[model samples]
Target: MNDIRIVPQITDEEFKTIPKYQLGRLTLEMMNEIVSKMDDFLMKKSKILGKTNKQLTRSDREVLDNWRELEMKARKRLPTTLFFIETDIRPMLQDRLRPSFAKAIPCLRHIRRIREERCGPLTFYYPGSS
Candidate 1:
């Protein structure tokens, strides 16, 4: 049996299936989620290659080792809240602050149109199904 499993091309939709945590401010819960998702993919890859995760090739094992490092750091860190912020530089003034902002937003009026143009669903479909 081939020791190395060929990783397939991942689509954007499939990429969304992989859980990602905030890199800037890693949290225990986020790390746990990432490890779980990584474990899931590793297990599937190992199964496809007809080998245990520990029996994977050097390159594959390296990937697993990186994951273990992340797990170790996650474990070592004391649990503390880390606030993360992302800012977008929009052309207009405080978009939500203007009186006219609430009046005639096209998206607010047309839910169907907004959904059609969206790259993905806007609903809060968080990881772990919870």
Candidate 2:
């Protein structure tokens, strides 16, 4: 069991009080930066482990998978942000969990109605159905 504790460097007060609005301003740019940082971090891990992603250890694979998911969310523009980062990686790369910003977009009636209106009548076509 690779039980090395993983702790964030940011203080509770700083994390809680940080400007969420400002952090969201450059969504695309932020995503790129995070991806770049993670890539570099993974490189360092590869050297330490003497293996690439194809042969990463269980622990390394776990961390890489989560970070890749974060990258996907950002690429999709689903309102993601960095929050707390690993302390060891200087400059503290971090991002806000998706659930944290999920509430920002309230599903209004008009929003739902717009989708309903655009979703034209269903037309079934079974070209290969016997």
Candidate 3:
């Protein structure tokens, strides 16, 4: 029951059933996780891509090009540990219409809130959900 899929599996419809405030938390967490994952994946891909390029050098003038060419075609996931900090930035707000809105994405408004004093958006609900 613990088998992992080759590709990442996103629970799309399942998202519809989650709570409002939590929707922001879940999706943001998901994006951050994937971003961190890709960073690691990129590292690994760089290693392989480099080694493959080296092999091409060993082969003179397209002699080994047939196989190495195909091998080189292949190129690359990891989560960052920065979630603790990112999650901390968005404190829950009790203001009308934006509890969930601000909860999910407060970056623009929150960061600029001090200088711009902007509230940004108030509704982030999906179609027919609100």
Candidate 4:
């Protein structure tokens, strides 16, 4: 296995949007950002591997496949729990092992929910969970 790692540089704060009430989901700007970032990395890999689709090497294909998933998630308003992101979503880079989204991705606490209702906070609440 002779290849370099292709890590995504999607940090926190930059990942979120302000629809206000729905705190867990993503937005279209994020989707566009993902698409742009995906294309950029494919270019980087293109230069490094020096190949194209269909005939691309298996090892190289792995990187593209990994990236494809990330791009797809943000294609719509998928939540952080389903997204390839960090805890508070800061230092998230692509991983070959592909860490559990349930364990790492954040969820909605909604302040009042934690204070008024049950205390199921981010990373431990809602749909992103398996």
Candidate 5:
């Protein structure tokens, strides 16, 4: 008899059984709650990616290559805060402030709506058990 070697496979459906961090208000709020987590992530990354000091041996040059990758990833994720402000926050705020701002503080509220979807009511839904 011939022996067969196979690797285990895990499909998304199988993984779906696990509770995931669904993208909802709670996740959004949690993203806001730990808003500075990316900052801390980047800060640690910064130290790791810093220029090697004079005392740093030349042989150590390759030791922190992974740190550079982590720093880049951290930098990429940090800007998501701006994305939330731009894509999500800007539209609702602009229409609300437009009339008042046009008369008072025009430039501050000069955001244009990014999509055709008219600014609808801002509804906050409470969490329910699944």
Candidate 6:
């Protein structure tokens, strides 16, 4: 049996937006940054893996699924979490996860941005699907 490992997921649109070298750089940066914000992240973003979909988009689901598969060998993986990443932070995280996304034959350019409210603890957005 293989030892368990962890992998991060990237969406197709994120793939097309960043290049390889930049991905590496951003990864290191985010790792350090997240550590710096560990307490806040723990309090605000940590969640159980099974409930991750509560905060993600359909496209994001595909990407995160791939991430879980890639890390299947690991005994334990990071429980899925969503932080209130700033708009600027989105680009940073996207850049880091892009290289892997590109190689996945992802639908990078085909992703469509539907008009929707941005949901988070501070803001009540998005109409409930009734």
Expressed as tens digits, the lDDT of each residue in 1-130 for candidate 2 is 3322122122333233435553443343343343344445544443434456575678677766665554453444323222112332335344442221222112111122101111122111111111
Once fitted onto the true fold, the runs of candidate 2 whose alpha carbons sit more than 4 angstroms away are: 1-26, 51-85, 90-130
Over all chains combined, what TM-score does candidate 6 have? 0.22
What TM-score does each of the candidates earn?
0.24, 0.26, 0.22, 0.24, 0.23, 0.22
Ten-residue segment with the worst summed lDDT in candidate 6? 121-130
- In terms of TM-score, the best-performing candidate is 2
The residue-by-residue lDDT of candidate 1 on 1-130, one tens digit each, is 5533222222334333333321223223333333333334434444534666565668667655654444344444323211000111111223433332122122221211111111122111111211
In candidate 6, what are the lDDT values of residues 10-99, reduced to their tens digit? 343444464653454343344334223332322322332434556666755664564444334233332323322233233434454443
Evaluated at residue 19, the lDDT of candidate 4 is: 34
- Full-model lDDT for every candidate: 0.30, 0.33, 0.30, 0.35, 0.27, 0.32
Best first by lDDT, ranked: 4, 2, 6, 1, 3, 5
TM-score of predicted structure 5: 0.23
**Candidate 2 displacement at residue 26 in angstroms:** 5.1
Compared with the true structure, model 3 gives a TM-score of: 0.22
Worst 10 residues of 3 by lDDT: 76-85
Clashes of each: 0, 6, 5, 0, 0, 3
* Model 1 segments more than 4 A misplaced: 1-50, 53-55, 76-127
Per-residue lDDT of model 3, residues 1-37, tens digit only: 2222212322444344445544554364452343334
CA lDDT for candidate 6 = 0.32
Model 1 worst lDDT window (10 residues): 81-90
- Candidate 2 CA-lDDT value: 0.33
lDDT of 1 at 63: 50
Deviation from truth (RMSD, Å), model 4:
13.6
